[PDB]
Design a protein around this ligand. Structure first.
Ligand SMILES: [Mg+2]
Ligand SMILES: [Mg+2]
Ligand SMILES: [Mg+2]
Length: 127
RNA sequence: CCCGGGGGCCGGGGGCGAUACUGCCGGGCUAGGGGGCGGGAGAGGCCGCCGGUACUCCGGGGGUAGGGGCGAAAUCCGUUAAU
């Protein structure tokens, strides 16, 4: 039998965070961040960091019962970057190799339907 | 240079003529303008009510120990449970 769940990915430009939950999302089976499996701060948003963090979390997911999951990839949406960072693709690649059965893949980046004033003033982030 | 004569010295007033244009008075028009009627267009304004995601914070549940940020860090947030 297949027990289903959700692989939530947070792929910003500074890290990557993979929490695996049940279908309702109320219960977390595994959660690994990039810095949790990476030697230094500079290597957190690397795809290599995601690929280790992806396989490390999914290994716990299989050990704790979960055997098939969907993937919901996201970036920091709204007043930030509206697409997943440079580690989300590597994260899902290690997910497929981990033995999990893959369901649907969705982008759930929170899109503002207008917005709020974002940082960095008005001249820009180099002036 | 002096003498003689004509003109001008840009104007004022008088009389007699013309009425093309301007002016005034009278009559009449609709071409400029304004006032209308009809169906539509418009982030035009003021007021009232409602919504959409996003965000931040607060309360509770899951789960450990990182998160955040950078060129790289650090400050900072986090073991009174964070992301
Ligand atoms: Mg500034
Ligand atoms: Mg003379
Ligand atoms: Mg004289």
């Amino acid at each position: 039998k297949l027990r289903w769940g959700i692989a939530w990915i947070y792929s910003s430009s500074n890290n990557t965070i993979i929490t695996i939950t049940d279908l309702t999302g109320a219960e977390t089976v595994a959660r690994v961040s990039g810095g949790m499996v990476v030697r230094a701060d500079k290597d957190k948003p690397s795809p290599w960091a995601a690929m280790q963090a992806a396989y490390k979390a999914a290994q716990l997911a299989l050990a704790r019962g979960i055997n098939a999951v969907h993937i919901k990839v996201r970036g920091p949406g709204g007043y930030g970057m509206k697409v997943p960072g440079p580690g989300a693709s590597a994260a899902i690649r290690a997910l497929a190799r981990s033995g999990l059965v893959i369901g649907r893949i969705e982008d759930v980046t929170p899109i503002p339907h207008x917005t709020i004033r974002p940082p960095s003033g008005r001249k820009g982030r180099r002036v």
